[PDB]
Amino acid sequence: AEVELTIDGKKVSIEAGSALIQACEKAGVVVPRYCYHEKLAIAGNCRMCLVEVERSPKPVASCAWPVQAGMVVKTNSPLTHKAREGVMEFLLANHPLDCPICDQGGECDLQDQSMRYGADRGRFHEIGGKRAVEDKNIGPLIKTSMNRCIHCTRCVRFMNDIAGAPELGSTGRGNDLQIGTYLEKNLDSELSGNVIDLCPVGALTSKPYAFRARPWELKRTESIDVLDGLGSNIRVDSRGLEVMRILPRLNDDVNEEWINDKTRFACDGLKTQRLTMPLVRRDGKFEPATWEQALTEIAHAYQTLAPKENEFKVIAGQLVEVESLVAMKDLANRLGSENLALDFPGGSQPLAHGVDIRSNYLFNSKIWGIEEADAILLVGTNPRHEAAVLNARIRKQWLRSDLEIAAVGQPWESTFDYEHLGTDLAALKNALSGPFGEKLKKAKRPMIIVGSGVTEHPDAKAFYETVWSFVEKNASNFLTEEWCGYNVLQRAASRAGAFEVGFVVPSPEVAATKPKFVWLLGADEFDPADVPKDAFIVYQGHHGDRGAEIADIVLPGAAYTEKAGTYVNTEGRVQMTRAATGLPGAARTDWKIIRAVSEFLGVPLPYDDVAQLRDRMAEISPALAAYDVVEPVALRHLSKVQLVDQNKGAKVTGEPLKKVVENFYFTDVISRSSPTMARCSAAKETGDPRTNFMAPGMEEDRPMGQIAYGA
Amino acid sequence: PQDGFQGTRLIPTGADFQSPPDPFIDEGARDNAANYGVQKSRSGVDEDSVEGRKVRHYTVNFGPQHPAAHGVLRLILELNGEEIVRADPHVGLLHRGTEKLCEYKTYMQALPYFDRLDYVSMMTNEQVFSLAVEKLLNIEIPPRAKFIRTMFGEITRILNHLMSVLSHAMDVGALTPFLWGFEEREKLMEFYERVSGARLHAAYVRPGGVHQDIPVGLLDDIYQWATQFGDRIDETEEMLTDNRIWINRLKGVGVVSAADALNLSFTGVMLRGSGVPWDVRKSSPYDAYDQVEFDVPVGINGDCYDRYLCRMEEFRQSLRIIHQCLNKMPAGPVRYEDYKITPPPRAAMKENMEALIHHFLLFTKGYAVPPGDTYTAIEAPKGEMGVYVVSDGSERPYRVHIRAPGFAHLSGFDHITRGHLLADAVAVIGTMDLVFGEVDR
Amino acid sequence: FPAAVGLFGCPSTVANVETVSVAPTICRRGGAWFASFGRERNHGTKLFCISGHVNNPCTVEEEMSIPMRELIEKHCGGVRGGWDNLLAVIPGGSSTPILPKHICDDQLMDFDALKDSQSGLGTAAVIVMDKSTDVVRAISRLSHFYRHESCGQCTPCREGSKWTDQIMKRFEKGMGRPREIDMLQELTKQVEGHTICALGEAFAWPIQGLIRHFRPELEARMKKFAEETGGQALAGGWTHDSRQKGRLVSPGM
Amino acid sequence: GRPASAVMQAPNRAEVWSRSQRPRSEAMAGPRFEQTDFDAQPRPWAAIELIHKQPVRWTHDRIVACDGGGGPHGHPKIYINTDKPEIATCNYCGLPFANEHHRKYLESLPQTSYPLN
Amino acid sequence: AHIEPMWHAWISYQVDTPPTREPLTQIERPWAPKEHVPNRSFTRGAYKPYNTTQPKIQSWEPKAAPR
Ligand code: SF4
Ligand code: SF4
Numbered sequence A: 001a002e003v004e005l006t007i008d009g010k011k012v013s014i015e016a017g018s019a020l021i022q023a024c025e026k027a028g029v030v031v032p033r034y035c036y037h038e039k040l041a042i043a044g045n046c047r048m049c050l051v052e053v054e055r056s057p058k059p060v061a062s063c064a065w066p067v068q069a070g071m072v073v074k075t076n077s078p079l080t081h082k083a084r085e086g087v088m089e090f091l092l093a094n095h096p097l098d099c100p101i102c103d104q105g106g107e108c109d110l111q112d113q114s115m116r117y118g119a120d121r122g123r124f125h126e127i128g129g130k131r132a133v134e135d136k137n138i139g140p141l142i143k144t145s146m147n148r149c150i151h152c153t154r155c156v157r158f159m160n161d162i163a164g165a166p167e168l169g170s171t172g173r174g175n176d177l178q179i180g181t182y183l184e185k186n187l188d189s190e191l192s193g194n195v196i197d198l199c200p201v202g203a204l205t206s207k208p209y210a211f212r213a214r215p216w217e218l219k220r221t222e223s224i225d226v227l228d229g230l231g232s233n234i235r236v237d238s239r240g241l242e243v244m245r246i247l248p249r250l251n252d253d254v255n256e257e258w259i260n261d262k263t264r265f266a267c268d269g270l271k272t273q274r275l276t277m278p279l280v281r282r283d284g285k286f287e288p289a290t291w292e293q294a295l296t297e298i299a300h301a302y303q304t305l306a307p308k309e310n311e312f313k314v315i316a317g318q319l320v321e322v323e324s325l326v327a328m329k330d331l332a333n334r335l336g337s338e339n340l341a342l343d344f345p346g347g348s349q350p351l352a353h354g355v356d357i358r359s360n361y362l363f364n365s366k367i368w369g370i371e372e373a374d375a376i377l378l379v380g381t382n383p384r385h386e387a388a389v390l391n392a393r394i395r396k397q398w399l400r401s402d403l404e405i406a407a408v409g410q411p412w413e414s415t416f417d418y419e420h421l422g423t424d425l426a427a428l429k430n431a432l433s434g435p436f437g438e439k440l441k442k443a444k445r446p447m448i449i450v451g452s453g454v455t456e457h458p459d460a461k462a463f464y465e466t467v468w469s470f471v472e473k474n475a476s477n478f479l480t481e482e483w484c485g486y487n488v489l490q491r492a493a494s495r496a497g498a499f500e501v502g503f504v505v506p507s508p509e510v511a512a513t514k515p516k517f518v519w520l521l522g523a524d525e526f527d528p529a530d531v532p533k534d535a536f537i538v539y540q541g542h543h544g545d546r547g548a549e550i551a552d553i554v555l556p557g558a559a560y561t562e563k564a565g566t567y568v569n570t571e572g573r574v575q576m577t578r579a580a581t582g583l584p585g586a587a588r589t590d591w592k593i594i595r596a597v598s599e600f601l602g603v604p605l606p607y608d609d610v611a612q613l614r615d616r617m618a619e620i621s622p623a624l625a626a627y628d629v630v631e632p633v634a635l636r637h638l639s640k641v642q643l644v645d646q647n648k649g650a651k652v653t654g655e656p657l658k659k660v661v662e663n664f665y666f667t668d669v670i671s672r673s674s675p676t677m678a679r680c681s682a683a684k685e686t687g688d689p690r691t692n693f694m695a696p697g698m699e700e701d702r703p704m705g706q707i708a709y710g711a
Numbered sequence B: 001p002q003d004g005f006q007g008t009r010l011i012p013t014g015a016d017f018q019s020p021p022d023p024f025i026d027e028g029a030r031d032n033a034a035n036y037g038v039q040k041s042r043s044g045v046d047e048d049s050v051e052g053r054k055v056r057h058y059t060v061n062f063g064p065q066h067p068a069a070h071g072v073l074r075l076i077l078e079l080n081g082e083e084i085v086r087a088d089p090h091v092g093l094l095h096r097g098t099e100k101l102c103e104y105k106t107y108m109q110a111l112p113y114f115d116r117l118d119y120v121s122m123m124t125n126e127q128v129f130s131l132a133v134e135k136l137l138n139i140e141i142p143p144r145a146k147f148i149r150t151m152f153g154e155i156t157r158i159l160n161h162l163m164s165v166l167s168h169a170m171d172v173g174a175l176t177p178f179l180w181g182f183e184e185r186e187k188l189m190e191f192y193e194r195v196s197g198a199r200l201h202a203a204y205v206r207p208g209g210v211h212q213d214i215p216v217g218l219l220d221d222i223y224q225w226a227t228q229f230g231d232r233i234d235e236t237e238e239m240l241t242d243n244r245i246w247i248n249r250l251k252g253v254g255v256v257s258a259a260d261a262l263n264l265s266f267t268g269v270m271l272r273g274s275g276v277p278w279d280v281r282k283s284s285p286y287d288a289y290d291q292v293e294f295d296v297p298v299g300i301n302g303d304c305y306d307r308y309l310c311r312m313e314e315f316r317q318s319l320r321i322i323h324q325c326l327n328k329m330p331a332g333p334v335r336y337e338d339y340k341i342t343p344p345p346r347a348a349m350k351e352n353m354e355a356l357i358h359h360f361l362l363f364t365k366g367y368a369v370p371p372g373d374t375y376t377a378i379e380a381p382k383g384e385m386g387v388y389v390v391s392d393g394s395e396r397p398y399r400v401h402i403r404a405p406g407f408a409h410l411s412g413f414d415h416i417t418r419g420h421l422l423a424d425a426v427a428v429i430g431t432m433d434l435v436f437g438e439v440d441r
Numbered sequence C: 001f002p003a004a005v006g007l008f009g010c011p012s013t014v015a016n017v018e019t020v021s022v023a024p025t026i027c028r029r030g031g032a033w034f035a036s037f038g039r040e041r042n043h044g045t046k047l048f049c050i051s052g053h054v055n056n057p058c059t060v061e062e063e064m065s066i067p068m069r070e071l072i073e074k075h076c077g078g079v080r081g082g083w084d085n086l087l088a089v090i091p092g093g094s095s096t097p098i099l100p101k102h103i104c105d106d107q108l109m110d111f112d113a114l115k116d117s118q119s120g121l122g123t124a125a126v127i128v129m130d131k132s133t134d135v136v137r138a139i140s141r142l143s144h145f146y147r148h149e150s151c152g153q154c155t156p157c158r159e160g161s162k163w164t165d166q167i168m169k170r171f172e173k174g175m176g177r178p179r180e181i182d183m184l185q186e187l188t189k190q191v192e193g194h195t196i197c198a199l200g201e202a203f204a205w206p207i208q209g210l211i212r213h214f215r216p217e218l219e220a221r222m223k224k225f226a227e228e229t230g231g232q233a234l235a236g237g238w239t240h241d242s243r244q245k246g247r248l249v250s251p252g253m
Numbered sequence D: 001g002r003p004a005s006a007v008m009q010a011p012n013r014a015e016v017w018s019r020s021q022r023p024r025s026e027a028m029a030g031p032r033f034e035q036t037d038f039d040a041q042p043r044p045w046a047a048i049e050l051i052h053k054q055p056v057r058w059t060h061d062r063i064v065a066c067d068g069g070g071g072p073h074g075h076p077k078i079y080i081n082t083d084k085p086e087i088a089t090c091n092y093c094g095l096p097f098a099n100e101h102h103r104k105y106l107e108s109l110p111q112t113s114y115p116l117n
Numbered sequence E: 001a002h003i004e005p006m007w008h009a010w011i012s013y014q015v016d017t018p019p020t021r022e023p024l025t026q027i028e029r030p031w032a033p034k035e036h037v038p039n040r041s042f043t044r045g046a047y048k049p050y051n052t053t054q055p056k057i058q059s060w061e062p063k064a065a066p067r
């Protein structure tokens, strides 16, 4: 129950067993902090949150003091003024005079709480000088400047608890206690860059970002990450033409103040291999074209080919937004094609789960549902390389509760413990018939999670009926008034939204019709068998990569940091990006390109504006008009039809499940063009813990340094 | 708001609350000689409302490209022969949006804007902005800063009056006093350029004191100048005070009564010329003024001649104040000793951590001014200069409005000038002492 | 609190060896038997490791609330070179404030009694010092001991045990001005009750007690260093002419 | 881009020293450079070459203080740890320091960043 | 603008010691202009400004793979 205390004269209620600092954020009372973070364990080390409490001889650490029945707390007394002034004097006594050369300046808690809570002048002038410690090499991503450390312990708590990376620590004792790894070794965690933001000071900073920007000259845009299927909420920091860095922002339902390194550190690939002009293939060379003489060249080819039903084919990639798929579905439909493929392997044939009921292809227990999960079965997915910040939530629930995890598929190095039940459908069949099925049966909030790798497999037909049959057998556990045990995990931002509007091959009759005109709508990981050699290929996208280099005509579209596009994440949350910058060169918005060519091809699309297309969108599925929320699947039990009734006789092959993410750093066009990810992969290949590994800086073997970054 | 869409109760207006004068004691149809048949509608046959909208008086654009315009004024004059029937001053030709630009600046970043309003009185303009922010900051600037600001406040007053009085004499035709007095002001801009690094836009007086301390030879050189400045006042006194052409160009010209001068928003000499004893440094003492003795020149006829005699007396009173400041200059800091407000010494910023953090935050974010609003006014050399500053509680002002004395004075131009000749308009522009950096802002 | 959650998260209690080494005797002999010694609120016997400038250092078991001089002058043979040669005693271990000769004369070696001296019984270690001691050196060595024995977890003792050590190392050789003695007094009181453990008190108390009874000694050698260098020292230990020799000296140093 | 005063990035260094530095040959080109005296153009010396002709300041102390040597004229006073067998550099001015405990190791390296002597 | 820098201060009464007797004219700077560098306006030696930074976005170099 919520107990009642008074803080600064005002009354506040809060659940018992809360920290007193927590009762302060409820009572609208500002309390200074360095070591305390809402998402970490309480450490008690900084001494900046000391407040006055009755019947208490000495100031109490508000972060570590349990709220009592009827305490009276003073956060503004002479005791608190004297403590905050004195602790600021201690934290600033061996702190380096490096505020001009530090990348935390203008965004520093130590200068903002020194200005608000400390004296204006220092009394520290010792002839002995300040403490100086040596710098450290913890990989290619995190530049070190350890004189700045104030010993808050936020990065060691994050690395050990949140991320499951127990390599960072604090060796030593006294004033010589030093954060780092004992041995000079790389930090191997996809959540690594999160210690840069957690760091109160700039001792742990970003190597790619070093010295480039100041925070006051940065425009702040609240957008969505599209580099995986979770739709992590991000803050995009731009200085005019150029994106400078990607920060996480709070969404406890989705990402929980964390982003992974690829979401974070691949933004430098937004400026490197871009498409800015239409190119028409002439005599085996790509020559520039005007937009008119590119759409005309497309229209002429389509007229010459005369594609009948389903000889027009469209493949959509990981980063496509719903304003493009709904616009492309309307273009192909009026051209006579229902052949609407997807970029993954097996993305050009009917899918094992259909798209009639949304609960077939979603994460039906929410991402927030893992917060309650008691038993989780994993089917053919590496939650680290697919949804890195969702993998952390599983670990968080696991450490603090009796959560049991087992998995079917390829073994993976994991941040949590799990039982490997096998690699194929025969193993999964024993898994449910065996102890983990009984564990799944006996548990409250049971959770089966199917990865999109299964949907790519030969036996997705058979895998998906096996799982759902277990679910339907076990409702009132799996299908209750408030619970959905069935989950499908998506690793690409475009795919749930593609399912939302039917952008999927309907029948093998459609899939068996060889196309002669193929539009690759941002598609770059397409299987070579899904693209005919003699088809007229049109590539639309923002990067010159595998898709653009095999096409006859390329059309420059927008990237996600320059469009306002809808994306649906793996659980069916509908989110919109916000443009951080304008369009480069002569690039267009993708749904305008599709609408523009509908003029040239003879079938113009009714809408001429984004609102008219978002009205079209909302009558394909009305959930697309409800942003930031997840709609409940009304007819949940109708998922039996496409999952079991439609998947009964399957030629099971027994081929084991695959590892669909070979390289975490390279998963799409933006990542494959990022210099920072190129250094992450290369350092991970050889283990070089050095900060300047393929970056500017002096080294012992590099006396003169280099201007090259990423080489 | 919503009710205004359709017809509702009419908002009451000054015409409604008009009252009829009592006929027992009313004497005369015009107690003012300003409206005594020296305006429009004193000739012709019909009024200019109907059947008269087809004709014009002789209308001449007096400025902007005009010497007597002293800059950037477009004074549209309607002449009946060589007599002014209507004067319409058109301003905004030096309007540069200073008050909007101040809203995208920190409080430090906005202070150089005040240098450029009355741009012969830079350090006085700086003071009124520095005293408004200091009031909203609830801080007390040290005694040495208060004595530097009053001494350079009166050095500024002399600099303005040299430009004002001798520009005014130049317009009436006297050339030589202008040349003599511009050596003295050329002398006094050394004192500016020695404490600041600028002859004109010092950026010296700032919220919290002054930017730097005066150099070690400055007080002796100011006193050396002071021992001869009396003779300078007397030789310009020697060409104009008794000159019979000076007396007949200014005596009886631009006459404003005491009760109308207040109603016209007149301040300074424009008000004190009419016989009112009023000085903002006497009535609301600021800085070190309540620590010095000075007299207040007050005229009795409210004309260009009395205003000239009051300004030539303020030369002598400013030099009198300056001497006392030199004598009473205390030791101590020239900046409030709080590094959360004023920048720390460069030595301290390079030596100590809390000094570096404070230097870094004061030059990027600025200091935060506690929320509220204030009207602060000082006796500027041209009148009551005021500022209305609204504070968010953040580091940028929400609103900075400058109350410029010459804006209030140029508005009463047609009131006092209609009926005089074209030369008398030139006489009234110079006695009213306009600088259009403050008029337009 | 260990009584709830302690070792391995289990209910726990920490107790000293001497505390536990008497309890069985407290039963076989009696609570009244043991409560027969010391003063009203202080009972029983005590061990007394009496080191320092005594002519016969030794530990001894002796009754609590014994006057210190008789404890020193009888069990340990008395102060080296006689009682008059005594200058100061640490009546507990290094974590208790120093006591000058003039208060040692009638001091009961007692939990409550040493408290009134603004000190503590501590561990009943008794370090005595002669009139030939460098007392600031003795205290500064302890301030150096605590700089090395701080864990480094919290801001006040990780930064304050090193800061206080550098001040004490300066104060030995008089590199400082007297108003810094007050500045060091303030520093210790910003540590005193602002820490995770009592080690912050353990390095602040010995400094404070030295300020409390030996400031003229601290003042005498600050004055001497000034005449030695031809000028009063600046804050931090810099010489008066630092600015003249092109050093960096903030206003007020 | 005919003369060397329009190609060499600096008189003391020919190539660029930053990732983003536009080469001089790529910025002295164009119509704005068609009747121009190239050697009259501002062509300052590269500081990256100059700082590295400084010799190492050898020291036995663990921690060195650098304030730029100018007193108030220099830079904010900082402290450089010299524990790694590597030349420690001041982050403000680039002056090189080494600890004598690595004198034998540094005088064995095939190359270095600053003159050891 | 033909007056050398140190003498520009002496002619301006900004110093009293002439550059003959002024120690700061002795700090050896190998990077300092050896020759006299006056105001170069109205000549072909007039300073021409330029971007010192590389462009901010790099376009794809097209690579049309063989069909
Ligand atoms: S962390 Fe960086 S910006 Fe903040 S106080 Fe320290 S040096 Fe200055
Ligand atoms: S490196 Fe940063 S997060 Fe880690 S202990 Fe030091 S200050 Fe805290």
Ligand code: SF4
Pocket: C149, C150, C151, C152, C153, C154, C157, C158, C195, C196, C197, C198, C199, C200
């Ligand atoms: S007081 Fe205790 S916790 Fe704090 S630094 Fe000293 S030994 Fe460590």
Ligand code: FES
Pocket: A032, A033, A034, A035, A036, A043, A044, A045, A046, A047, A048, A049, A050, A061, A062, A063, A064
């Ligand atoms: S916030 Fe409570 S001690 Fe650090």
Ligand SMILES: [Zn+2]
Pocket: D066, D067, D068, D075, D090, D091, D092, D093, D094, D095
């Ligand atoms: Zn340096």
